[PDB]
Amino acid sequence: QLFSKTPSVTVFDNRGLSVRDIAYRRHPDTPKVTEECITYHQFDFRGFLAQSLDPRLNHKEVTNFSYLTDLNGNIIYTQSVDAGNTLVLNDTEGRSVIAMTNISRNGKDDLSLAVTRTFQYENAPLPGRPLSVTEQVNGENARITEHFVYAGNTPQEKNLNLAGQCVSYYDAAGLIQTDSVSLTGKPLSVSRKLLKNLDDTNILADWQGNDTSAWNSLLATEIYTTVTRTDAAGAVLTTIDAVGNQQRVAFDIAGQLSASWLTLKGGQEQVIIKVLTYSAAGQKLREEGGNGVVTTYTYEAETQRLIGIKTERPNGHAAGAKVLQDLRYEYDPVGNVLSITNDAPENAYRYDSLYQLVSASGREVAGAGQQGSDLPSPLVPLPSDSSVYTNYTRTYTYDSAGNLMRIRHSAPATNNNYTLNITVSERSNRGVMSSLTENPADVDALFTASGSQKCLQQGQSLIWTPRGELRTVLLVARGETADDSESYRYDGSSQRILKISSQQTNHSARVQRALYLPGLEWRTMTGAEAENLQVICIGEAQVRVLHWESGKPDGIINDQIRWSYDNLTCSSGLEVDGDGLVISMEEYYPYGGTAVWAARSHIETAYKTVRYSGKERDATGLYYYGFRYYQPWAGRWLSADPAGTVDGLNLYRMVRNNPLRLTDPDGM
C-alpha cells in the first residue's frame, strides 16, 4: 500500500540522545512529495534539552524555548513562546514552596503578573508536612487558601484512624473536616462544609489568622458531609452523601461488578441491573438494565474492536419485541476506524499517513444549519423517517506544526456548503477562526502572558485566576447586563464544586446556581418559582436520575431513572427509560459539532447536558471537558494547557486527531 515507506526514525549524537524527530509524512492524494517531517532537538553539555523547534521557524531564525537549572541539573525557571516563563520551586526535600506564571515578553519582563502561590509546613518535632498554603497576589497580599490541619494521636484519633492526619482541610470552597477513617485507611466520614454562602463569589475561602473561631464566619450552613463503610477488600460497602444520597455494590466470585443499588436522596435503594453478561476480558457483552432492553456488543476478541452493537426490546418484554438499533463498525491494521453504519445511512473517514484525520463524511440532520456556538432544537418526536439525517461530506486540514488549518464541507442534499478557516500566529499557537481576526499577527496580541485567551468566544468577559482557573465569565448577555453572567467555585483539587450563573434580566429569575459534590450535582435554579433539583452519579460511565426539591415537571415523575449509551467514545448518544423507549438520540462530529440532535419530547431538552465525548456541555454548546474545555465551532480546546509538553508542542493540541486513537477523556 502507498502507506508503505512512511517510517519513523530517531537519530542521536555521540552522547546518544536523539538530535531530531523523524517521520515520513505523505498527503495521499498528492503522493509525489513526502514532507520534511523532521525537527531539531538540542541538549546541553549536561545532556539536557536546551532547544527544539517548529521547522517552520527554523529558516525564520527565531528560538522557541528557555530552560534554567541547578546543580543536579533539574529545570527551574523556564519559558516557551506559548507557555511563557514559569516557575515552581521546591525544597531540598522536594516540598513545594512557591509557584508563578503569566510573565510578559524586551526581557525586563513584568513579574507583577506572577500569580503567586506558596506553601507552609510543620515544625519540629513534627516531620514538616504541609499544614497550609496561601495565594499571594503578585507583588501584593498573601491569603491562606487552605489548611491541612493534622490531627494529634489521641485515643479519639486512633479510633478514627486520624492519628496525625489532616482532620481539617480548610480550603477553597470551605472545609472538609475529615472526621472518621478506617483501619483499612479508607476514610469513613468527612464533613464537606461549603462557604458561609458558597454562591457568594467573593468571600475568601482563605483561612487567615488563629483558627476557625474566626472562619466560622466563612464556612457554610451547607454541612453536606459524606459518610462511608468499606469492605476489607477496600471496595465500598456503602457510602452516603449525607444530604441523603447513598450507595451499595456487590461483586462476583472474583471481583467484577455484579450489582449495585443507589439511594436517591432519602429514597429507597434500587438495583440498576436486570441481566448482565461480560466478555472474559471483563469487557461487556450482553446487558439489560432496569431499562429491560436486550443490548449486546460484538468485537474482535483479540482486540475488542467493536464490530457492532445491537439493541432491542426483547420478545416478551413489557413492550414486546422491538429492535432499537444495530450499529456496525470497520477498522484498519493498527486499528483506526474507517466507517460505521446503523439500522433500526453510513459514514466514513480518512487520515494522513500520520493518522492525522482528513475526512469524515456521513449523514447529518436537516435543518440543524451550519454550526455556530449553539445547540439547535432537537427534532421531536424521534423521526421514524429514513432521510432527515441527510448525507454530507466534511474534511480536516492541519499545519506542518501541531496546528489546524481548516474544516471544509459540502452538504449536497441542500447545497448548504461551507468552509471554516483559522487565523493563527506568525510565531505561536495563538489562533482562531478568521472572522474573529483575519490577521495572523494581530491574532497573537489576543492572549495572556500565560497564553490563555484575553476574552471569550467573541470577546465576552472572562477572568483567569490562581490555580490558573477561569472563575468568572459572561457567556452571552444583552447590553452587557450582568444578569446573564456566570462564575464558579472549585476546591484546591479544582473540583468544580459550584456553578453560580444568572440568566434572569426580564426573564424567569431562577438564578442558575448549581452545586457539585461527591455523588451529587445539585441544580438550585432559585427565585419564578425555584426549580431546585438533585441528580446523582448513577455510575462514575453513568446511568442518570433526577429529584426535584422544587419546580416540579409536568407529566413527569420525581426520581425517574434512565439509561444511556456512552458509546465507543463515551459519547452519550442515546438515552432510554425504564421501559425501553428512547428519550433522545444525538451525535456529533470529531470536531464536536452535532451531526444529529433529536428527542421524542420537547422539554426533555432541559434534562440532558452530558453528551458528546461523554462530557458535560457548558451552556452555549462548548463542553466542560473536565478541567479544560472544548469549543465545537472551532473544534478545539477553548483553553491552553502547556503541561501538554509531555505529549505535544501546541498548547491547544486537541488529541491525536483521529480521537479514537486514544482511550479515555478526562478533559484537562
Partner: protein
C-alpha cells in the same frame, strides 16, 4: 497593515503626546511659560510634541535634556530645570514608547530599540510623528510609500538583527562610534554593503570570543581610540597598556602586537578600529596555527615578490626554525 500603525499613532499623539503650556506652568513653574520658551527655542512642537534628539554615547537621556535648557537658560533655577527635565523625559518616554508600540511589532521589531532602529534609518520619532500628522494616514490611500519603505528597511534590519540577537548597546555605540568602525559614510543605512556586514561579523565574533566583558572592550576602545584622538594624536602611553589589555582579552603577546602595529606603520601603536583588531586577531589565528614570529609571518609577503634572494633564504631558515621549534612543541 500600515493603516493599523497610523491608527494608534495618529490618535495617541493628539491625546497624550501633545505637551502643553500648563504642563510648563505647573505649580512649581513660576513666571515665563517654559512651554512657550521651548516653543521658541525649538524643543517642543506647536503640537506640543517633544523634538526628540537622537541618542548617543556622548551623552544620556537626562544629560541631553539638561543641556537642552542649560545651554541657554530661560530659567536659571536648577529646580525648575530638573523637574522640567522630568516632564520632558516622561513626555519623550511616552512619545517614543507609543511609537514603539504603534510600529507593527509584527515587523519582528523589538519595541525597546525602536528609536535606534529609527536612527539607523536616520529618522527619529519626532519626524515620524511629523509625517504621521502630515496625513494622519489611517487609510490605504494616504499612506505614501516613502513611509512604508521605512518598515521595508526594517524587515531587512530586523531579519539581520534577529540573526544577530543584537544588544541595544551595540547599535547605540555603533552609531555613536562609526569612527571606531572601518567606515563612516553618509547613507550606510541604505548602502548596507559587505564592509559593514563584515564589520558586524567580526565585531560580534570578537564579542563572543573575547576573554572579557563587552564594556571592558568598550573601555579598551575608549582608552585606545578616544585617548589617541584626544588631541590630534595623544597616546604613546597606551600602546603597551592597550596591547596588554587586548592580551587579557585575547591571550596573545602584547609585545608581538605592538610589533605588528609597528610593521603596519600604525602610529600611535594602538590598533583601535574593529577591522584593526580583527586583522591583529587574524595574526593571532596564524600564531595559533604555527606560533611563528609574526615579524617573519608578515615578512612572508615579500617571498611572492622574488627579485631578491637574501630575504628569501632568511625567511626560509625562519620557516625551518618554525618547523623545528613548533614541530617540537607539537611533538615533545
Amino acid at each position: 497593515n500600515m493603516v493599523t500603525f497610523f491608527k494608534g499613532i495618529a490618535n495617541g499623539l493628539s491625546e497624550n503626546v501633545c505637551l502643553t503650556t500648563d504642563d510648563f506652568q505647573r505649580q512649581e513653574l513660576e513666571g515665563a511659560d517654559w512651554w512657550t520658551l521651548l516653543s521658541t527655542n525649538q524643543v517642543i512642537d506647536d503640537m506640543g510634541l517633544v523634538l526628540d534628539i537622537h541618542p548617543v554615547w556622548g551623552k544620556s537621556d537626562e544629560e541631553m535634556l539638561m543641556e537642552k535648557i542649560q545651554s541657554i537658560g530661560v530659567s536659571n533655577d536648577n529646580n525648575t530645570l530638573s523637574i522640567i527635565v522630568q516632564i520632558l523625559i516622561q513626555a519623550k518616554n511616552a512619545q517614543e514608547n507609543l511609537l514603539s508600540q504603534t510600529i507593527s511589532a509584527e515587523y519582528g521589531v523589538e519595541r525597546s530599540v525602536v528609536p535606534l532602529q529609527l536612527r539607523w534609518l536616520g529618522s527619529n520619532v519626532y519626524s515620524v510623528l511629523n509625517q504621521v500628522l502630515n496625513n494622519t494616514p489611517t487609510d490605504i490611500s494616504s499612506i505614501v510609500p516613502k513611509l512604508s519603505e521605512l518598515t521595508y528597511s526594517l524587515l531587512i534590519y530586523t531579519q539581520l538583527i534577529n540573526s544577530l540577537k543584537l544588544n541595544k548597546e551595540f547599535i547605540f555605540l555603533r552609531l555613536t562610534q562609526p569612527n571606531w568602525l572601518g567606515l563612516t559614510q553618509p547613507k550606510l543605512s541604505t548602502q548596507l554593503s559587505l564592509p559593514e556586514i563584515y564589520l558586524i561579523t567580526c565585531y560580534q565574533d570578537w564579542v563572543v570570543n573575547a576573554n572579557k566583558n563587552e564594556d571592558s572592550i568598550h573601555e579598551y576602545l575608549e582608552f585606545a581610540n578616544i585617548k589617541k584622538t584626544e588631541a590630534e594624536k595623544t597616546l604613546v602611553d597606551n600602546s603597551e597598556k592597550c596591547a596588554e589589555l587586548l592580551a587579557e582579552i585575547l591571550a596573545w603577546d602584547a609585545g608581538e602586537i605592538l610589533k605588528a602595529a609597528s610593521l603596519l606603520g600604525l602610529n600611535p601603536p594602538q590598533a583601535t578600529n574593529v577591522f584593526e583588531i580583527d586583522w591583529i586577531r587574524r595574526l593571532q589565528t596564524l600564531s595559533e596555527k604555527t606560533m611563528i614570529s609574526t615579524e617573519y609571518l608578515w615578512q612572508m609577503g615579500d617571498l611572492t615578490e622574488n627579485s631578491e634572494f637574501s630575504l628569501k633564504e632568511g625567511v626560509g631558515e625562519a620557516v625551518m626554525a618554525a618547523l623545528k621549534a613548533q614541530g617540537d612543541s607539537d611533538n615533545v
